């Protein structure tokens, strides 16, 4: 069983800046932590990121036939984005939406979401765990 | 190492009326999951709900004064009270707001939290295993 | 067959000031007002009044576990409390709610109410009498 | 006494449409048994309905030259009408809003009346027998 | 030289009747005001009073097509009526709006005009004298 | 197969207007061509236009009684008139909203409809065509 | 009869822009206008014009003592000036507002007015006459 | 003429799911239909789809070189995107706004496009026949 | 005369963190400096604080029904309750409300208040000396 | 030593009309009321009243050039004044907002003030004395 | 070639406060650098300050009278006042807006202005040196 | 010292149309012209435009990762994009955005930015001069 993570614009940056806010890790590590993460969970994750619009869209449609399981992080689009929120929507597996930084403690801005409606679960400043804790909701379910 | 669990107005009927949106699992069910994934995980975890707000304030304040981290599903309470948002904002160790249905997909009152800026993070959506989640990202940290 | 009759914050104050806005009626005339004339209609009412919300959330509980029919007058809580109304949308039997002044002729927020999209129906500015219709409508349905 | 009942647009089609909402008593039968429950209370019940909001501006003014009570359901023009609210202004006799359907679990605009603020009461979502109960009401004052 | 004098629902019951904030004057003695001064003027005022928007509006297009100025008191329509502002902005002649009360004065909603952006001008709150300076101001324009 | 074409207040000017906003056709010409491209279609077009709600509300009555589409230009109506829509809402065959003008490039106001949320579908600003499209549609379903 | 016609901010420009708008006879030409206009009414006319908050509030306050009443057009401070409603707001004989323009028909903040609902009526889009038809209100009262 | 059909993101997955809103037919399907039915009017269609802005004011940008009318269903777009709406701002021939869905009869947000005002009309929720109209449109002019 | 001072939610924590804001002195030492201060003004302080809305509550009723005069600081309730604004609403003698901190200077929602509207007067910001004026400023009644 | 109490426009009007929304005393009363109280208090206040933006402001400079607290009640521009609020913010003693009536208790745009969030404190509703318990408060905290 | 350069209210404290928000440079120091700045230019440059809202207008009228370009920096009135834009709207040559500070990284409120859409442009959060590049700007036309 | 110069989605349509508000100079002549402005001033500027969001973000990244200044002309994206913003956020040294036109003169949504926050400096309405200005700034910095 297989699982799709995708990150969206800014992701790519992880670790490169902004140390207090969304930590030291970067991208290539945490795809590193999660694919560890996940084959001892039984899980197998393809760990993409993109800055993509366009991209991210392709991802999701591939997930919705395949009909794998997201977890979706896609950092800015998820304030702006109704495309995305559509392209989602067509899930049957489960969507988890996962902010690394708390959101609600920032810009009034940041605390609307397109995804989160049509989302199973967010998973919201727990840092880098959020995706770990995610796999686990996943395997469990 | 203590975590406390609190909950709010109304999660002591979990299971009993309302499934569907709320899962099947009971709190005394619930109760039970929490000490095996405790004792798994290697703490301790305290779990009490009270309908009455001056009771989750005076549990809060002795979380404080105990430097305990906390794990909280204030109901009804998170859309409305400023003063379970001031007892939580002394908290020195984490704070984890957790809900166990999707807010967002529901009344549009409801996506509005009191407790989510001064909280550590917040798990939606996750089900029972939201507040078991919690207590593995507490685990690690 | 029980009809419950709940009265939250203030309504224990009935009849001494406002004149004038509530009636002269007292909240002990009441409460044997709502009695008899529940009776002439078959109906057994049992009339329950507190100033604590959690007080009203296990009133509310019980009526949900017993089938019960219940008269809601939450006075202030009615603009303000997301926890009572998710007490009462789990009730099964009728919910009607019950204002003795004219809400809608006073402040702007008395006009929005957090119960009345999960009630049966309201009863607004026809004084004591409200509760009395109230209980004709249950005996009717 | 004469009291008379105002249906405005809409309410000639009465139970022969989502019935389901409004119910499946027809604007006749209402008639009916307004007449009789008129009897049993020592009034007399003049029941009005048109499609027009000159009509309804019309009996208005009649009802308020005549100083009779005016029981009202001006259907759709309730959120839309301020004339009709001027019109009943000068009504020195008492004026119940009555809704067949619980507005308040509806469309948000069906929420705001511009009649309420100007009625002794309002009655919302008892269906037909709300007519009734605002009927009983003006009995006793 | 002719000008419509045009008055809106609620207006056929001047100060019968509502006295009130609108004077003792009849509808009746306002014609014969508004003709006395309008021949005192070398103006033919012709004045129509009418509950009805669908009645309005034919007064209205004739005016059009007339070309003949409008002195209009639509009353409640004022605030709600977008037909009655599209029948007044084909007017090519003069249009004015009067209205006997301040309308700033009172309710909100009241401070919002859908037919003052397409009027010529405005005159509030100087009561019948309201009629007779328009006429004054067109008979000089 | 009969079709109910229906035009709301004003609408009875066109061409008598303002060209290049609704252009330089009149009423008459529009229900011919209405007339005779429905035939074109093998479908049978009663059209009407009135300035009054309370007329064009009985007609939707009988297009719902009928079970016959409803092509509805409401003019102005279609901003402010709730009762209108509760009428069409019992259509149980298809309602097609037009505007001869794009409401959209006008005032705000102009960009609410109360109509199109129960409506079939909506054709909007391409001129006196959108009704022979609308027409087209049916002809298919 | 003492009548205070008081300009505000930029009435100075008068006639030297905005002809269009503002129409095109001078400040001065203004003030003979009204006081001839005065003088042939039974009244005596002060008027004057400040660009300055202060000066216009000292006027407005001398004209309270004196009880007179005032034609007031606050320029630019119509929209903005509380501490000038407020001066007002002491006037016991009455105070008309006047602006030249229809405010209502340009850019949306100019439709709100401070000044409004404490004035006894407004005049608004009359150009010039405005003042001149004030005149002949305080002429009867 | 040539016309450009363009559809934006989510439309290639067109029939795949799912059809309650949408319908049964593939975005393959749909270039056939409007292929045909364009050929058949003797217009030449292209007819193309993207799930990236910037593809799409690539074409939108060709569209205006070449002074060829556009019909465009931006999909989410449509909802979010100035660049969209200042890249259609520059074209010459008409633009019709399409969509398949009804927008008022679903989530809040689609109640808004950035396109519709600099649209010359546009055509929601007739479906697939949406294309065809607007084609139809064009052909008439 | 008794003066009742009565602390809500959270103020049992005083002095005991968060001293930037609050700052140093405990409730304690504060019911101490309270009570010095009100003898040496001629007056009896009851000082008296609680986590329980529905015990501010009853304080009031007692305050209320011994025509006592009541300093309040309601804590968070401030923003939040509608019960305990109706509670004071009662008071014959004066009402003071309090707040230690600055609430103008914060979060947004601590700027509105259900209290204020309904106290006489309102001291905020001045730290713990605010108690003190609002003493001093009853024994000057 | 020193406190400066401004008044802003109309406060010089103050019981010249509606008491008991005000009520009964005339700005002059009140400069002698305060003068008198800060005196018994060991300060000297210098009572000012102007119905000019321009005016307040430059008393404000001064009074943040002299670091001396500044008792504030700018009537009408408390709501409506951007150019007052940063004068203000540039008081590095201490400064007390007053208002004579509540606020809070009449129309809705009254209930925002764009110097209630650089000031100290506020005291509302407390009629005349509010100035005077405000002088209390500098008085209890002379260092 | 003549530039007026019109400071309002708080400008005359430059540098001797905040160095950090709007630079060390004194009135004085800047005076002499625009005008220095303006020769090298070839302009006059004559730069002005006032705490005064009546002295700022006067100022506006007379660049407007002498056809002459502006560079406004308003101050806090730019927030606030109508009468200042409504002077502006006045002037023939160029307009340029200039804050030294980033307006828009600061307060809400800070983020509007009444000034921006009249003048030519605005220079933002540049500093001292906003004053120099409009200079430039006024050169080249 | 190099400079990045960044032109957002459209931007390569300059002088390609809408001459009365972007100018008539093209993007290749802006490139040219800004290249040779910034070798005057002693800098290297590295200009580029992409309708690509995804491409814009790389562009930002690089800049951040090299301490490059950053001249920022969104476009479109201005209004729109969380994501450009967060890529900006992170530039260490100076961000000046730019616009052609003057965005407050044009329609209400173009007065917001996501950029401006996070940016340094704002010009706005100088034309293509903007640009040049822009360089000045960063000449001195
Ligand atoms: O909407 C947000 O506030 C947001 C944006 C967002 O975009 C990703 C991002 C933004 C800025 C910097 C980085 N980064 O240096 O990895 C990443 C991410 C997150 C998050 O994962 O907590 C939250
Ligand atoms: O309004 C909420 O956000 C809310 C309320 C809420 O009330 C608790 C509740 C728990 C169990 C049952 C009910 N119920 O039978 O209405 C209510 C719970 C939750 C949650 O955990 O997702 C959320
Ligand atoms: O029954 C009501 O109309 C009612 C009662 C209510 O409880 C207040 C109250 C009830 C009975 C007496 C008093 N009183 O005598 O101070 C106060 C509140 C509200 C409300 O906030 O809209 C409404
Ligand atoms: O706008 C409403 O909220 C509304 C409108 C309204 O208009 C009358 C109406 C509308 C649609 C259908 C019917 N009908 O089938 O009687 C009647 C009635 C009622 C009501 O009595 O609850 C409520
Ligand atoms: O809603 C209004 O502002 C309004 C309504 C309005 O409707 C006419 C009207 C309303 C209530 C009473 C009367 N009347 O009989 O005098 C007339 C009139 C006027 C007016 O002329 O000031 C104003
Ligand atoms: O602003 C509207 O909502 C509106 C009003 C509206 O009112 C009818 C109307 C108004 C003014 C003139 C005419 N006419 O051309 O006769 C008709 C028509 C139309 C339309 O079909 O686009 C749109
Ligand atoms: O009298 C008016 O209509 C008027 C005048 C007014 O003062 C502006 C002004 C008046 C006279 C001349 C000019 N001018 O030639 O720049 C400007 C402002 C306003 C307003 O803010 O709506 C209204
Ligand atoms: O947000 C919209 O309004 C929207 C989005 C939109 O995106 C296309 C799309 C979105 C979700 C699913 C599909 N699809 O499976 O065909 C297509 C299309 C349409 C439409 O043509 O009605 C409307
Ligand atoms: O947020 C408020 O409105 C608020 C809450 C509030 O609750 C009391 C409180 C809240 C949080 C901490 C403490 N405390 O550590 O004493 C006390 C007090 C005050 C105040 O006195 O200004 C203001
Ligand atoms: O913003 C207010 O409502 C306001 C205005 C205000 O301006 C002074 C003022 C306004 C109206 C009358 C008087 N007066 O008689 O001094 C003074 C003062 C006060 C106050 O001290 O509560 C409040
Ligand atoms: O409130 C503003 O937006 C504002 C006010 C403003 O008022 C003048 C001012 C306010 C506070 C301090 C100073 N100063 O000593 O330069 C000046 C200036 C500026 C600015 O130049 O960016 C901005
Ligand atoms: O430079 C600008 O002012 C600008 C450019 C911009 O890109 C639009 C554009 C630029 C050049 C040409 C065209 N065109 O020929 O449609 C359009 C958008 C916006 C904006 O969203 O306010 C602003």
Redesign the interface.
């Known amino acids: 069983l297989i699982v799709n993570v995708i990150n969206?614009?800014?992701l790519?940056?992880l670790g490169?800046?902004?140390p207090a806010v969304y930590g030291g890790t970067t991208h290539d590590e945490l795809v590193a932590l999660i694919e560890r993460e996940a084959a001892e969970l039984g899980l197998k994750a393809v760990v993409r990121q993109?800055?993509?619009?366009?991209?991210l869209?392709?991802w999701i449609?591939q997930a919705?036939d395949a009909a794998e399981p997201v977890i979706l992080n896609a950092?800015?689009?998820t304030?702006?984005?109704?495309?995305?929120?559509?392209?989602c929507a067509?899930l049957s597996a489960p969507l988890?939406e996962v902010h690394i930084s708390?959101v609600?403690?920032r810009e009034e801005?940041?605390?609307?979401?397109?995804l989160?409606?049509?989302?199973?679960?967010?998973?919201?400043?727990?840092?880098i765990?959020?995706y770990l804790?995610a796999l686990?909701?996943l395997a469990?379910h």
Chains 1, 2, 3, 4, 5, 6, 7, 8, 9, 11, 12 share one sequence.
């Open positions: 969206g614009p800014n790519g940056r490169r800046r902004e993109s800055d993509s619009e366009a991209q869209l392709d449609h919705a950092g800015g689009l304030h702006t984005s109704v495309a995305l929120r559509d392209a067509e988890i708390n609600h403690a801005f940041r605390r609307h979401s397109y989160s409606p049509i989302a199973t679960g967010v998973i919201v400043g727990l840092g765990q959020g804790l686990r909701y469990e």
